[PDB]
Structure formats: structure tokens, C-alpha cells
């Protein structure tokens, strides 16, 4: 079994990594018939699809493809930066087969660096 | 495949882009009997609902249907910006049949 | 099809809208045989359920029983102000059939955020 | 039908209600074969169970005891304050029945003790 | 029953538990067919799979299989500490059986609390 | 006569409209023998050409052909919004048909 | 020889003048077989072509309807105003025989202009 | 059943919206055999027609002809702005096939109202 | 006899009144086939239509609808304030039944 | 077709890409007998020629969009350009804002 999402890219054909390090710009998601998809924008103009469940997809792969919509969903609204999506770059826009997040910036780094905004205004 | 809203909306008859560039104002969910349906209201006085699942939707809307609920509902409790609509204008309120959201 | 809360109330027998304009006070949930259920009580002592799901209830609602479970626990934990219940009257407690969720800036909220433009303006 | 988790515990034999005003100090969850279960405790010490589905659970459990893990999930990572949990006291840990959650200390109650430390402080 | 991560994980062969007191540093998912997986790392470079659904897991495991995806994720989003896994040993990377969070508020998250303390009210 | 891109483009097989609202991203060129043609791209990864001057197309399309080309260099170094591009979806890129422009 | 576009207008059948003081709104233009043209529209609705060459007109307009979309596309990408066009209202739409444009501050909109500046001097 | 003009409009093949947001300009009526017709025109030199009933009519239709006549020529005579026309752009003139009517406060009459504000407070 | 327009809307199914205390914002007619009718808007968002006339009427109705339309219109031309309407809410616009109009 | 200028480039013997991303710091052009050629030198050195004469027409075209390129101070992107010839002749050009 892959241990990242660039070694799981490379057992299958027609797939590339794009590395993003930024957060969802757009989300769209339609339920009308033969379009049930999502559909994500980066600030750098990179579109990607989640595609409309069809015949070139395994009974195994129905649950993974409404789970890919629910996280692109929560990763949108809650700003997560996405680090790398694989996808096939067959389709238009090309189509998710996986992502990774992961922020750099730890936890508290974050009030550590608002505390020192603070802290270099007053004294 | 379309690779905006604006592009899906025109596949469809009966179907017309609002642009609201808001959050939703009100949410409002039934489970009554025949009225198992989402509406959604802006400032602006723009009505919207998610159909009750009935005779005019196919098998595979029928999660998508209950995934639109969803992103409507956490959309409303997040004050997240709507950009467009895509609905079908035969149906009062107007129908949803696709949303965008852009910050 | 009817376009509010309101109006949707009025097409059903034993309902009535409660206008709260309130954050939910409770929320109680049960795993228990028979009384898998939900309970929601406001700070005016206004108490409704999500009844059981049972002989009363036709297919088409069993989703949507549970989608009201979820939008309950949500709402809340986001205190997030409930507009309108539709409920039936002929359940103890009253059973709910529907709800809208609006930001109706409460009384004395107006009065709150004139004191906040006249407090960040002297000191 | 019962109004609160009280009477709601007092249906079931071999129940208790404890009392906690506290929210939940850690969340375990397991997928091994036949302890598909979740875990909480409270600072206090109390340790309680959702039990793994089986022979002693109604057809009508199945869904509700999902949505308990899902409830005890997200009320760990928002902190809320459990109020009582009713449980089987024959079952170690002790096995949920159901939850209260009570909210009370007031939205604007926040604010208004916030501008009388800064109203009694420059005029 | 057990009562805690560590006697669950002393109930299964080819098992140990790791003790993170972290969050999760990298939250990896696929929908690609035979690789529907979940992949999390730690800062300490420690990898861990949620394993594709197949022939050595029982009916009962498929919901919390879904389930435990669903945790890691939340968990991940919401910056939540894992106390500890308990992995199958047998699978590379390890293959996550249960997963433990417990609050305890870090080292330095007590020197951040107090000068939260001290800077919001010199300046 | 039609009055609007998208009757234009529903005269002709093999044609679609898509729905841009957006300026150019790069405008490209080249006067090698056989690719005497240009190329425009947009932020969201759409190609489309104009093509090289053929058998495909008849005498009154040769002026506009060469219009078209000015139109979309223009266009691009004044940054105007694109709305609409009808083009054939036979060719690779997608070959430009008609454009519209709106504030 | 006429002075102005209206006098030009009048010495053809079928056509009239629209007023517009206007910018365009949109510019449409076409490369395709037997439809090599060119649609502008204005706020107000007003939709007007500019004909594909054909067996209405003679040799001398050849170059005058290829000019004419020229000053349509400039006029568009400067937004200039356009004071008037004559066109044949036999066409659908009516088709464009000559363009004027002027930036006309309007009859009264020069004393509205100096009634501000003496408004906007004495209170 | 459409809510608005353009929604009405957009129901039948060769119409289109022209927005005046202006009086009528003339209006002209004949009763002369074969032309028992009116016709408006516009500042901006637009011109429109109520047809001669007969040719291409349901009988439906003689009622709201015979409306349209009468709106037309008490909006001309009352200076009341016209919001929009829907026509029938295959007739010369354009033929109405619907009008609304709001007023809709001109660019410079809103500069006018506060000039006859301030004019009427000085002298 | 109903005495007042609220008595005169209880007479009927699927009717409700709306109190608008204010003159009408838009007045649109349409002379087009199958969509002979009149639309009103307030300045509240409230749309009302006279619906087109046809089986769902009895003759009685015909020459009602008529002056329906025509009161719609010189109340539009006069901002008039509108009273209360009765209205069929089965209907999209909602469909005038009855107008008051009241000079306070 | 090629869908972009490295593509185009590549299926021609003689000719490489230049990546500038930065706008032309001078334009020559020339009426002169046999020499009715443009020049386009950048901030980097780089000089490219249009050569002297339906590629008639794409002749006259790349000599318009050099100069209005020049004019707007539009960044070049890329050129594709033969290498047979001293200076380098401009076979394609790209500009990307």
C-alpha cells in the first residue's frame, strides 16, 4: 500500500499530482440529472472536478466518491489549505482521484505570531 | 462536462443564473408529509427550494438531493457568501438545481 | 408549493407556528428502545420532539426525520437563533413538522449595538 | 412520550441518571472486529460506553446508536457541557441511553459583563 | 468490556499502541478504485492508514470503517490532539483499529493562556 | 438572423457555447508555414483556436477569420471581459466560431 | 451631400434614427459560413446588426461594412458613447447604415451642473 | 404563469424587452379602414405598434388589444414612465405584445429633488 | 351579503388576505395569446396577478375580471393607497380575488 | 494542432523557445528595398527579426502585434524563433499578463 498520495498517483495511468498549498477559491455542486458533481476553483485559476458516478467507476468506489464531495465541502468553508489533489488528466476539468491537506503552521503558531503583531505595536 | 455553473445551467430548459454574491438570510427545512423540502431566502426578497424527491427526478438525484440540503444548511449556519444559483424557473419557488459559493 | 414556514403550516390539521426568535436552550437525545427520539426546550419553557419514527410516518419522511435530528444537535451547538417551529398540537410534547432559522437581531441587541458605536467612539 | 431524559430513564430498568455540568475530557472510537464502539470520560473519573450493536438492540437502535457516536464526536471537539447522561449501570463501562445538553449562561450576557468592566473603567 | 484504548488493543494479535499527545500533521484521501484509504501523519514523520474495506473485515466493521475516515477528518480540520492509536502492526503503513483524544491542555498552552492574561490588559 | 451568439452557434453542427466572464489569460501567434493561426487561453485552463485558413472554410469567412484574430489580440491587451465563445467542439483546440463581449 | 446622419438618413427608404447617448453594452462578432457579422446591444434592449456582405449591396460598401464593424469593436473597448444610428428597420435586427458619436452632456444637464456649483457655494 | 415582464416575454419566439423608463413621446390612432391601429413613439426615436386586430389573433386576444389601446393613450395623456415594452421584433413598427409601468426616479431627477430641497430652504 | 373584504375572502378555499396600506410600485399588462392578464407589485416584494381568463371561471366572472383590470389601472395611474387584497394562494402570482381601498 | 507555443516550436527543425517574461525595450521597423523587416531587442540583449517576405498575411500580422505589444508595454511570455538566422527570426510569439 502507497504511504503518500504522489506513490498512490503513480500506480495509476493517466494521473498527475498538482500541488496547490492554498485553499479552496470556489465550490460549486449540482444535483440536476446526469451533472451530480462538485466542481472546485483555486485563486489560480485550476479547476477540478468530483465526477457524476458512471461506468468506469467500481461498486467499491460509490462511498469514496460521496465522502471526496463531503470533505472538498468542509476543507471550502472552513479554508483548509489543500496541499496535493491527484487527478486524471484525461477528463475536463480533470477529475479527483485523491487529496491531501496539511497546513505547515502549527497550532498556537498562529497566536504566537498575533501576539507578536501585539506585542511590536505597544512595546 | 461543463466547467462552471453557468455552462451547467444552460444544458437545462426552464433553468436561469441569479447571482447573489451573499449569505443565506433565512433556512427553512419541513419533514411533513409531501413537503419534505428546503427553502432558502436573501435580504433581497429571492426565494428558492430544494423539490420534494418526486416523479421528475431520476435515481442518481436522489443523494444529490439530500446533499443540496446539506451545503444549504451548513452554508446558512456559516454565513458563507453564495455566488449563483442555477434554478428552474417553471417551479415557485424557483428550484435549485446548482450552487456556487466563492469568498 | 408554498413559499415560508408559514404558509406551509396551514396546508396540515393540529399544527400552529411558534415564533421564538431564541437560540435552543436543550437538547436531549435518546438511543433508548422505542423512544429513539429527540427533545428541544427553549428559556420560555416551550418543549417539542422529533417523534419516534413509526406507523404515523410515510417512507419519504424517514429521511428527513433524521435530517431534523442533525439540524437540531447543529443549531444547538451553534446557538443559532430558531425563528419558527411548525408543530403539531396533538403530541406532548408538541411534535415538530418544521423550522426556519433567521438573524432577527434580538430587543435589547439594538440597544447593545448603539452602546458598542458610542463606547468605540469615546473610549 | 417523556419531556426530558429524567423520565425518559425512569422508563428502563437497571438505568441510572449522573449528573455532569461538564464537557467530555476524551472520545475513543474502534473499528476492531466486534468492539465496533465509543468511549468517553469525564475529568471526574466517569467512564461510559455507546455499546456495540447486537442482540440486545432493536431493528429501530440501529440508526440511533450511530447517532449517538456522531453526537458524542462532535459535543468533544466543541467542548459543550454535557448536562445528564442516562445508562445501563449493568454494562462496564456503563452503557449510554441517552444525553442532555443545557446551554443557560446568556448570548449578550457576555457582552454586557465585557462593556460594564469597560464602562466602569473609563467613565 | 474494555474501559479504555489500551486493554482494546491487548484483545487483538499483531497490535500496539502509539502514544501521539499531537494532532494530525496530514489528512491523505482516494476514491481511486482499490485504494479507497485515508493516510494521517504525525510531526514526528509517524504514517498510519485507514485500510481499503476487504475480506479480512466482518460486516459490523464496514460502518466503522466510514466512521473512523469521518473522525480523522474532523479531528484533523479541527486541530483535535490524538492521545493514542492502537495499529495493526501486520500492514504497512500500520493500520489504524481505534484512535483515543484527550484534551490535556499543552506545555506551552498554559504560558500562551497567561500572556493572553497579561497582554489584554497592559495592551 | 439570428440576434445573440448562442441562436448563432444553434445554426451550426458540432458547435457549443461557453460561458467565460472572464479577460484572456494568453494570447498566442505564429505565422509557420500550415499553423498560420492563435491561440487564447483563460485562468481556468480552457484552449481555443483560430484556425489556419483551409478548404473547411468558404471565401466570406477569409476577412472575418483575419478579424477575429485582431478582435481577440485587442481584447486581450485591453484586458475586456470575454462572456460568450462559440466554437466547434470537432477540433482540438476548440475552434473559435464567434465571441461576445459585455461589460 | 447631407451635413449630419439625420439628413443621411432621410434620403434612404425603411430607416430611422435612434437616439441613444449611450456607451455599447455588448459586441458580438461571427466567423461562421454565411453568417460573417457583427450584433451590438445597448441597456435600454436595442439590438443592431451589422450585415453579412450580400446581393443587397453593391461594390463600394464592401469596405464601409468592414470599417463599420471596426468602429463597433473600438467604440465598445473605449466605451464611447454613441449619439445616434440610422438603420433599416426592414431587418431584424435593424441593420446599421451609419453611426454618430458625440459626448453630449445633455440641453439641461449643463444648468443642473452650474445650479451644484452655486448650490454647493451659498449652502 | 410568469411574474414579471421579462419573464413573459421570454415565452415567445420573436420578442424581445426594450426598457424606456420614459413617457410616451406621441401617440397616434386611426380609425381608418384596415388601419384601426396605434402607435407610440419615444424620445430615442423607438417606435411600436398595437396591430390591427385580426390576422394572426385568438378571440381572446380583442379584449386585451382593445386594453392595450386604452393604456397606452391614458399613459401618454398622464406623462406616466414606461419601465418596459415586450414587442414582436418580426413587425414593422415593433407590435406590444406586453407593457409595465413603475416609476422608476430618472439619473438627474434625483440631483433635481435635492435642488428643490435646498432651493426651497435659502430662497 | 359579506359586509367588508375579509368576510367576502372567509367565503372561499385556498384564499387569504394581505394588508398592504399602500399604492401599487408596478402595473404590467399583456395582450399576448394565452397570457391575456395583468401583474401589480408593492414595494414590499408582494406580486399579484388577475389571472387569465378562462374554464376555472363562470361567466358572471368575465366582466369582473375586466374591471378588475381596469381598477388595477387608474389605481396604479392615481396611487391610490391599496387597502387590503383577497387573493387565491393556489396560484402563482397569487390570484386577485377582491381589492379595498381605503382614502386613510 | 499544438494547444501552446513549446508545442508549436517543437514540431520545426531549426527553432528554439526564448521564455523573456518582460516586455520589448525596442522596436525598429524599416520601408527600405529588400529590407522591409522589423527588430525587437529586450533588457536582456536578446535581438529577433521578423524576416523580410497566406504566411503573407501572418507576415503583416506579427509586425502589427510587435508594435502594439511595444506600445502597451505588454510582457512577452515566449517567443519561438528559427536559429538559422542572425538575429533569430520570430516564427511565434506568446503573451501571458
Redo the contacts between chains.
Sequence with gaps: ?????TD?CA??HNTQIYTLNDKI?????????????A?I?FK????F?????GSQ??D??K???????D?L????????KV?KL?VWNN???HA????????GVS??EK??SA?KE??S???
Design positions: 500500500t502507497p504511504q503518500n498520495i498512490l500506480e495509476y477559491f470556489s465550490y460549486t455542486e449540482s444535483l440536476a440529472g446526469k451533472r451530480e458533481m466542481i476553483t489560480n485559476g485550476a479547476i472536478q468530483v465526477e457524476v458516478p467507476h467500481i467499491s468506489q462511498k469514496a466518491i460521496e465522502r471526496m464531495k470533505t465541502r468542509i476543507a471550502y468553508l472552513t479554508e483548509a496541499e491527484c477528463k475536463t476539468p479527483i482521484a485523491a487529496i491531501s491537506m496539511a497546513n497550532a498556537l497566536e504566537v501576539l501585539k506585542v505595536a505597544l512595546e
